[PDB]
Amino acid sequence: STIEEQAKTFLDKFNHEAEDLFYQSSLASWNYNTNITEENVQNMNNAGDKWSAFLKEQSTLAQMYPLQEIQNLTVKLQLQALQQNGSSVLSEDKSKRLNTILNTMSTIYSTGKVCNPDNPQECLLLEPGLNEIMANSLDYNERLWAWESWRSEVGKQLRPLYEEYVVLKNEMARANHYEDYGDYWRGDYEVNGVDGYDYSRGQLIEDVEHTFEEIKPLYEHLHAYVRAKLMNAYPSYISPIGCLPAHLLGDMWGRFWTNLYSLTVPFGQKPNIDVTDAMVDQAWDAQRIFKEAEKFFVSVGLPNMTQGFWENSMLTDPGNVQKAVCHPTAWDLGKGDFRILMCTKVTMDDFLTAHHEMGHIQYDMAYAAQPFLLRNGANEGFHEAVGEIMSLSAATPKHLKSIGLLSPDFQEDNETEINFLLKQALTIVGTLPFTYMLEKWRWMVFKGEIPKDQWMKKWWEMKREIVGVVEPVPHDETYCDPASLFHVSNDYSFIRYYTRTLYQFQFQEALCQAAKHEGPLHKCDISNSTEAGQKLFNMLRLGKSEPWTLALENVVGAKNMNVRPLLNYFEPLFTWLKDQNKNSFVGWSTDWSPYAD
Amino acid sequence: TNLCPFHEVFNATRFASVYAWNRTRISNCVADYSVLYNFAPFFAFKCYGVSPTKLNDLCFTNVYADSFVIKGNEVSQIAPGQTGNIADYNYKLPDDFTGCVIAWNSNKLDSKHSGNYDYWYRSFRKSKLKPFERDISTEIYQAGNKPCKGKGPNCYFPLESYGFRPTYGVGHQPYRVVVLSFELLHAPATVCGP
Ligand SMILES: *[C@@H]1O[C@H](CO)[C@@H](O)[C@H](O)[C@H]1NC(C)=O
Ligand SMILES: *[C@@H]1O[C@H](CO)[C@@H](O)[C@H](O)[C@H]1NC(C)=O
Ligand SMILES: *[C@@H]1O[C@H](CO)[C@@H](O)[C@H](O)[C@H]1NC(C)=O
Ligand SMILES: *[C@@H]1O[C@H](CO)[C@@H](O)[C@H](O)[C@H]1NC(C)=O
Ligand SMILES: *[C@@H]1O[C@H](CO)[C@@H](O)[C@H](O)[C@H]1NC(C)=O
Ligand SMILES: *[C@@H]1O[C@H](CO)[C@@H](O)[C@H](O)[C@H]1NC(C)=O
Ligand SMILES: [Cl-]
Ligand SMILES: [Zn+2]
């Protein structure tokens, strides 16, 4: 009789016609990716389109039920998920134009090709060509040519398309009662209607700024060390007090510094940890890798995996008869069908990737009892953090010693853990300034805070101010370097990686405290600990039925992001770093440029 | 002597839908129970008042057998005192139950590719189901304060089909349930074992 009962009944019809259509769709996507044919593309399309039509009619009805007359928080959350009309508010022709712009941008990025002047017919793709051209080669000129060619050949194409994308996304966001598209993106971290647990959308900006201000000393010490190493490797191209050229960061866009490990290793004589020799010694395979990782997950108290996971999920290359795309993914088809798609090789990296993917699967199984709308992580950063803490625990020397991969006569020394922590910082710390840089620029370009005539001027200025990276060659306003990234040109929020980086170490410290661990955090393991697994499950089972602040507090005891665990993790590395940088200049100057002659 | 239709009810080819469960009233029998164990490795042989291992030497009046098909998650709802979708609108056991259910997994006979939409269940009902009462009516469900005239915004069809596929978890898998309910009353009894 009341609006609450009508909403309850409505959400049941949805929560039960939705599971069926998502299965018939997720199954179509799964068997398309596992077996690429054209019949399978056509099946995926029909099923996905039926899914979308269902969601749209259900959204017109949910619009019908007002949100101001609902007391139950769960029903409010479910309807708010349903009532989000997205881009349907934008008119039909403008919606078509926005879709065409998104598709054209993604296509241009996908088939981007650069042709060297020595042979017009000889051109290389970004993947896997330019990636290996500029991620392995130590030549300054070839790296500069790859960087400049890729940017001048995709950013110039993507500039007007990105302008139209910005305009139409801003119009849609303003039509959806948001101030700009950045506000729409930040709307995920928004929780309201709870006393003391609310989180405004600008609170996210303020929090991320404070955490970056806290992180900056570690990053600048790491940057000073990396600059010294590169200046040793590139004698006449890097100034000691300047900034690293954008293309000398071991990656296409400088997102990750992991490729600098060969150049910036602390101690080059200490053997690095590698169990691949033991993998090929004991004749391990995909099945053994996944069984070992499952036994690890059982050791912490989390349950076994369903038999259907072993029966139908493929874990190995299926020959050459049928081609399959196997980017490592954890599929939650719904109704109990949890499957994993990744081409497992006998490698430690694949071992940790299997651990991460099955952590994702554990998360999916945890909240299977929640209604359909709430079957997801509390925010966009929880899934990857939950998956990655497992990989952090699985890489520890104690863990690999327990499994038998490392001989017990292995000598653990301070130099080995310094090397491990430096590799982690290159992978983990080195991407936080870039992620914050990119998301801040996207926010200030969606909000209209920077004019179109200074998209690139402001971008490079604030990149040199934040990340400490200068361009090797001057760029005019015709280029669209931010659009050259995968996530920017495919409409993906990027701060999820920053929040994941913070949450993963918060969770690691919270679990390691519960595992009565003694000593440094970077050595810690949660295996054979039922208390830590119970604590993690207490948040995993929630899903997103409760505010992410409450889910975070249920593990770490805090209602917001804090950075202290991240420095507690890197404390030995930090001390070694700041001991090394006594003869180097920390910080940087924004005036110096490679092309200033 | 006097064989019993227990084999017949346990080995039918299609077990009815849960909202229209199939009930048979065994009255004249010898009540043999050696043939009960060998049917399948039953998923839930939970007995509610009679010695399950030794059911013989006890004489009742009538034995009702009720055949369903329900999900694995909903098997735990078939018990004297549970509440939920099935146990409120489809099949409710009496509080003073005397007898016991027998549920086993049937995925090679009750699920097909592209969904098996031949098993239904009621999810919307104006009142909870009283014990051993079945309602097969498919009348529309008015969930709002407005006279409804068919499926629309605030008016839903009650029955919702069971999507069964051979690729679903153990809890969403088609489970065949046979509930045996014994009634004893002051009357000439016939069904019991020696
Ligand atoms: C992949 O799909 C094609 C077309 O449906 C089919 O002929 C082939 O057998 C499939 N490969 C498998 C099932 O391994
Ligand atoms: C919302 O409804 C569900 C089911 O009707 C119930 O379990 C939950 O406690 C309700 N929430 C509140 C805050 O009462
Ligand atoms: C299922 O979990 C139990 C409890 O730890 C374990 O003993 C058993 O080995 C697991 N199943 C398999 C197939 O490993
Ligand atoms: C976990 O427990 C098992 C069985 O007690 C043992 O074999 C294994 O070495 C333990 N691992 C760790 C890391 O303690
Ligand atoms: C049911 O009976 C048929 C033949 O009457 C037999 O083939 C089948 O195995 C029986 N099923 C069970 C479960 O006993
Ligand atoms: C059980 O199913 C049979 C098969 O059609 C039917 O003849 C019988 O009437 C059903 N029992 C009922 C509806 O009580
Ligand atoms: Cl760049
Ligand atoms: Zn992941």
Author numbering:
A (entry chain A): 19 to 615
B (entry chain B): 333 to 482, 484 to 527
What does the original paper state about this entry?
KP.2 and KP.3 carry new F456L/R346T and F456L/Q493E mutations on the viral receptor-binding domain (RBD) of the Spike glycoprotein compared to JN.1, respectively. Mutations observed in these lineages, especially F456L and Q493E, are located on the interface between RBD and human ACE2 (hACE2) and are shown to affect the receptor-binding affinity and substantially escape the Class 1 neutralizing antibodies (NAbs). RBD with ACE2, particularly the synergistic effects of F456L and Q493E, we constructed recombinant subunit proteins of JN.1 + Q493E, KP.2 (JN.1 + R346T + F456L) and KP.3 (JN.1 + F456L + Q493E) RBD and determined the variants’ structures in complex with hACE2 at a resolution of 3.30 Å, 3.30 Å, and 3.29 Å, respectively, using Cryo-EM. Consistent with previous reports on earlier SARS-CoV-2 variants, the interacting residues of the three RBDs with hACE2 are comparable, including Y449, N487, Y489, R498, and T500.
However, the interactions surrounding locus 493 vary between the three RBDs. In JN.1 + Q493E/hACE2 complex, E493 of RBD forms one salt bridge with H34 and K31 of hACE2 correspondingly, Y449 nearby forms an H-bond with D38 and Q42 of hACE2 respectively, and R498 binds to Q42 of hACE2 through two H-bonds. In JN.1 + Q493E RBD, F456 maintains the same conformation as in JN.1, hence E35 forms two salt bridges with H34 and K31 in ACE2, further stabilizing the rotamer orientation which points to RBD E493. As a result, although substitution from glutamine to negatively charged glutamic acid enables two salt bridges, the electrostatic repulsion E493 of RBD with ACE2 E35 places E493 in a dilemma, resulting in significantly decreased interaction. Out of the four single-site mutations, the most critical one is the L456F with E493 (JN.1 + Q493E vs. JN.1 + F456L + Q493E), which exhibits a huge ~10-fold KD drop in SPR experiments. Although the F456L substitution alone does not affect hACE2 binding affinity and Q493E diminishes affinity, the combination of F456L and Q493E shows a surprising epistasis on RBD–hACE2 interaction.
